[PDB]
Design a protein around this nucleic acid. Structure first.
Ligand SMILES: N[C@@H]1CCN(c2c(F)cc3c(=O)c(C(=O)O)cn(C4CC4)c3c2Cl)C1
Ligand SMILES: N[C@@H]1CCN(c2c(F)cc3c(=O)c(C(=O)O)cn(C4CC4)c3c2Cl)C1
Ligand SMILES: [Mg+2]
Ligand SMILES: [Mg+2]
Ligand SMILES: [Mg+2]
Ligand SMILES: [Mg+2]
Ligand SMILES: [Mg+2]
Ligand SMILES: [Mg+2]
Lengths: 482, 208, 482, 209
DNA sequence: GACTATGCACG
DNA sequence: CGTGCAT
DNA sequence: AGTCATTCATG
DNA sequence: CATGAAT
């Protein structure tokens, strides 16, 4: 039967239960790889299934369900809506997912349902997962205890700043705008050398956000404020152009609008000005966006103050908005308001961790084989008595043992020797084996170096960051203005 | 429901009758909004031949069609007050797409004869493979693959170039070239009566 | 540019396509496995995934997506709906899918969305799929051209009659009622011995339908008409009973009801008869069915004539209804009205192709193997020599030619020998190999018999049909009255 | 009617079940003792009564059909005796979100129905975590002498009964407002309009590691 | 996560 | 009508 | 295959 | 009024 609890208690082991999970495991990105768990699971899964940029598209639903039975015990709607986002290029600066089909528009009409679309990781998402198979990142059990999943991706490029994040849990929210890839790399490259770098200097490399929708970002001092405390308010304003039409009438042509802003609503609200005559002079409001460009025409009446109209729209619509930084992320299992420094440093800390692990890993492998090759090179000198011995052996188990005790071989080697196919006995060419013993010695040095020279480690990390840059770098879309 | 063309002009404008919102959405993105409207049809369309002209005027799909085609239905049908110059049916390459084409044509044949005998009713031909339409047009492209399971698995700009673009698209045009051998064809296949049809199937459908 | 088709011809081509497809590939079952293509796909996919009766459950959506991406290019809601049905023990006589959670009830309320449920094949579904790896059924390519699908399953029991179908194509439609597994088998066994059996002998083993809902079936004459032409109209009446109460107030208690009936509507529709007072003196209808029993109690009035109430309920509700046979299925690629005989025959016919195929497969397997074993027994007597000779060989290919030329081993034996791992040279006991040589000839023999002698094949068909019966047999639920 | 009613109208043993989702909603209809147990599926996340306008709160279907199904009316217009159920039980997934829901509901059964809560009438069901069922990771080690329930929805209508709905085999947490004051502060801060007190509360009370 | 409407053959 | 695969 | 509603923190 | 993972 019953057991009583206080209203002051049952609201305690509940809301505190919710809070923690929603914060650690839901709405906030991990500062190192810039991913909320749903997204990281999406990417890990699609990758686990060879569903990548170089292979054919796979039906979205096949993917979605696999995620839901393997890692993300939640809505399939939630999972798909997330997968869809990672694939839309007016929300992501560097899209992680490629989706054949109707995945939406800037007019924000619904993406086709998951039964119609197919999808795969983008090439650059490969880079987020680069070297996962090498024990670089920490894993944990799935909700189900059937499979381990990574807690954070290797992140070969600094995603959390490049793509952005957003952003609503309990007790905290987050908004981090996207940034140009080349620039964020320059930044991190610099700071790899100068750990103790000033925001002012970093900002020579990272001048401010670069939304995928471009436009104009106004507010130098306010960017600094944000890059420094993580909170800041900047202005985002549309790219505008004016066209003198025949009749003395002018026309305002919009060609880029503010991040996160609905082109369809924006046109509506603008025309709703025209129809209420709040400011005077607007004649026709006409969207001319085709499949290969943004173009809104605002045809003003003859003789009408085009500055008064344009400014009216900036203040009273989303033709111009305020974008608020509120950069929060999960450093060390917990939510942290952070600016450009903790971010880049945390990323750098991570790459380091990663590159070390990665290197311990290949070196392990390279060791284990070098050890066997050493074994094999030796057997050749004593092939006859070894076949002889394996002959007089009772069984596999006794042959390894015998091999050891008779000739100093080790388990690892005894095994390799005792599982060679009879036809290996044809070969007697130590010279090919010796070329390999050499190659492996060299490989091991290079790695070992990396592991034990802090500096060596970083130039590698830089070498790699630059390659990422060279391959994926693209031009700014959003202009900056003091 | 409907997405208009940015400019009324009953002589140049095309009305795209699309299969389901998802395809109807790829279309809303590929169109030349200046002269191409998009009316998406949600699910299998009502058999205007089997059902009662009573329950027929109660089907939202049909009402939102008689009203946007803007000429009423049946005998009160003003051919001249038409809204669009070309009425195009866009369905998946699949069988159920084929089925719909049937259901629609029976409507346009039965409750709007005038627009059909006027050669105003067309049928888009999306691509099967990827750019080749017929199984033969495929074997050719292998000399000098992605098969399409429906208009919905195609991307917006791909859609345009291949089916919606006037300069680059191939269309069929339903011409009633015999009011007798094109009546006994609708009533057998879409009629209230099942036996005739069971026979027609038995006579013309080779099951290999 | 535009091509001109005739309305007469466009309608012809288009309806023809739909017609044909929707007939052979949607609404009608294959006469041998009694499965519509989606049903078949579900089962096959689940099986390929090891999502079987013996292993864990599995989020439904995982399965559904996998099905929709490898085999069945249609809505995820169709797939799940069908997957659900196969798992509901009040629609299927012998459920093909087991599902944890909310699969619905006889009350007709909806199942849990596929995000909530998990599922796996039933033990017996296993049997529909038995021997499918063994190249026993014609495969074709999937819509993708990426993977092969079965076109019919092996069917270790005669699903078409046992679980029934239904059934709405174009030009044709189908309705086949469930049947008691044990009895359908008895029938097929007889017809295996007496090919020419006629309906009357047949009905001594297969008296008629056995709905999982149970109840009472009146109409022995129309059952034959059905088993004879395929159509026919039997009668299905609720299992009733009478309890007594205080004040001399009799009660009608219903415990079974007509297959395909919605318990809820049946209850309301009855209770409506009370409200409207369409027959004299009902007290109160009440559904008292709980998780382990069906119970609609119909309480009557003090001076209430129970035998008129009950008879009105039978006539004017679904408390008793007409089940119509309309047994259509797809024999040699086309729709067929078929009776108890064409069905039971095609099943034997099939089971035959299946047992032959399976037997050829196993036979070739044992043969290729016997061959290798013959090889190894020879080696052992010349082990030193063969080792010696390999050692003297140059690469692997040279070893094999040397083996051939010098000891008359065969390509396949040379390969086998030459690719044995060293430790094999320890367990060098021939008496054990000789044992396997024999076990294998015996096996090859027993199988060659089957292939060469129709009677020996049918004798298996029977052995096996009984094991299935012993293993899954159960009592009737529906009782018969002529 | 969104609600599924009890067979016989006895507000003396009649229990009202507030279940999270139609998934478990139905799995709850099936598994119940229909003579005295009603089911009300809560479709969505129950509205925050402490955050929103008493205007908007009333125009919320999920709350209405509770004001109607409870049969007492909210506010001070609350007649704790003209109610319709002895015990009102909140049945949710044994998950994070289920917890969140347990919350939002409570705040409503306190903000706008204090009596029902003070009368020890509101409860909270206790579904199982493992399967031979257990409730805590410690009670599992004792059965080791192995299914894992991801919530009420992946549970079978017969199983949910023997385990959490049966008035004999079940264990119900019984909500009591022990100290009307030290309680008002907790509901007021967690579920309140003010963000900064919540933040601090999480920081001082939630252990991140 | 429920609701909403169609086609098809059949009493 | 209510069925069950399909839109 | 869209439509409806709620959380949570922010300007 | 939105936002985006969640019910
Ligand atoms: N008037 C009703 C109240 C509830 N409701 C909605 C709604 F509008 C949308 C969704 C929805 O998108 C969704 C999903 O899986 O993505 C899941 N659910 C259910 C899990 C709760 C929704 C619900 Cl209940 C509207
Ligand atoms: N305009 C009408 C109103 C009702 N309607 C319905 C409807 F009532 C139910 C379903 C439905 O179950 C379903 C599914 O995947 O199982 C898919 N569809 C869509 C593919 C067509 C449905 C639709 Cl459109 C659309
Ligand atoms: Mg949703
Ligand atoms: Mg503004
Ligand atoms: Mg289709
Ligand atoms: Mg449906
Ligand atoms: Mg009747
Ligand atoms: Mg849950």
């Amino acid at each position: 039967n019953i057991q009583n609890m206080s209203l002051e208690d049952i609201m305690g082991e509940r809301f505190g239960r919710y809070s923690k999970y929603i914060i650690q495991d839901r709405a906030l990105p991990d500062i190192r790889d810039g991913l909320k768990p749903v997204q990281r699971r999406i990417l890990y899964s699609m990758n686990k299934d060879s569903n990548t940029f170089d292979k054919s598209y796979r039906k979205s639903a096949k993917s979605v369900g696999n995620i839901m039975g393997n890692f993300h015990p939640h809505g399939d709607s939630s999972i798909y809506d997330a997968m869809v986002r990672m694939s839309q290029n007016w929300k992501n600066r560097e899209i992680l997912v490629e989706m054949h089909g109707n995945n939406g528009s800037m007019d924000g009409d619904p993406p086709a349902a998951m039964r119609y679309t197919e999808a795969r990781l983008s090439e650059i998402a490969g880079y987020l997962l680069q070297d996962i198979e090498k024990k670089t990142v920490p894993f944990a059990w799935n909700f189900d205890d059937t499979e381990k999943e990574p807690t954070v991706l290797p992140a070969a490029f600094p995603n959390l700043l490049v793509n952005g994040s957003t952003g609503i849990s309990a007790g905290y929210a987050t908004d981090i705008p996207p940034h140009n890839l080349a620039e964020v790399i320059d930044a991190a490259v610099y700071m790899i050398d100068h750990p103790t770098a000033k925001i002012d200097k970093l900002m020579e490399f990272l001048p401010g956000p670069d939304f995928p929708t471009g436009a104009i970002i106004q507010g130098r001092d306010e960017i600094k404020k944000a890059y420094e405390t993580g909170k800041g308010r900047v202005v985002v304003r549309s790219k505008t152009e004016i066209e003198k039409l025949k009749g003395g009438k002018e026309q305002i042509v919009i060609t880029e609008i503010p991040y996160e802003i609905n082109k369809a609503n924006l046109v509506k609200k603008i025309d709703d000005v025209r129809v209420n005559n709040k400011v005077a002079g607007i004649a026709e409001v006409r969207d001319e966006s085709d499949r290969d460009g943004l173009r809104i025409a605002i045809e003003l009446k003859k003789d009408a103050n085009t500055e008064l109209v344009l400014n009216y729209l900036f203040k009273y619509t989303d033709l111009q908005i305020n974008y608020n930084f509120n950069m929060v992320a999960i450093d060390n299992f917990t939510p942290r308001q952070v600016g450009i420094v903790p971010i880049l440093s945390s990323y750098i800390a991570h790459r380091r961790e990663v590159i070390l692990a990665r290197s311990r890993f290949d070196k392990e492998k390279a060791e284990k084989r070098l050890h066997i090759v050493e074994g094999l090179i030796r057997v050749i000198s004593i092939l006859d008595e070894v076949i002889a011995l394996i002959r007089a052996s009772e069984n596999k188990a006794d042959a390894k043992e015998n091999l050891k005790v008779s000739y100093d071989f080790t388990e690892e080697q005894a095994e390799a020797i005792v599982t060679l196919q009879l036809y290996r006995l044809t070969n007697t060419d130590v010279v090919v084996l010796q070329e390999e013993e050499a190659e492996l010695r060299e490989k091991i040095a290079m790695l070992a170096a990396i592991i034990g020279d802090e500096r060596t480690m970083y130039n590698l990390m830089k070498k790699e960051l630059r390659e990422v840059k060279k391959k994926f770098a693209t031009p700014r879309l959003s202009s900056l203005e003091d | 429901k409907l997405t208009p063309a940015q400019s009324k002009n009953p002589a140049k404008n095309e009305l795209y009758l699309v299969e389901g919102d998802s395809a109807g959405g790829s279309a809303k993105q590929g169109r030349d909004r200046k002269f191409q409207a998009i009316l998406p049809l949600r699910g299998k369309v009502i058999n205007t031949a089997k059902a009662k002209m009573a329950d027929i005027l109660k089907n939202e799909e049909i009402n939102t069609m008689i009203y946007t085609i803007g000429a009423g239905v049946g005998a009160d049908f003003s051919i001249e007050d038409a809204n669009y110059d070309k009425i195009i049916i866009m369905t998946d390459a699949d069988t159920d797409g084929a089925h719909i084409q049937t259901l629609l044509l029976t409507f346009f044949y039965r409750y709007m004869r005038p627009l059909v005998e006027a050669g105003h009713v067309y049928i888009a031909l999306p691509p099967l493979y990827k750019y080749a339409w017929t199984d033969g047009e495929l074997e050719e492209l292998r000399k000098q693959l992605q098969r399409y399971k429906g208009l919905g698995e195609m991307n917006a700009d791909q859609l345009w170039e291949t089916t919606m673009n006037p300069e680059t698209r191939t269309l069929i045009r339903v011409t009633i070239e015999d009011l007798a051998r094109a009546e006994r064809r609708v009533n057998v296949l879409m009629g209230d009566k099942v036996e005739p049809r069971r026979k027609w199937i038995e006579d013309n459908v080779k099951f290999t």
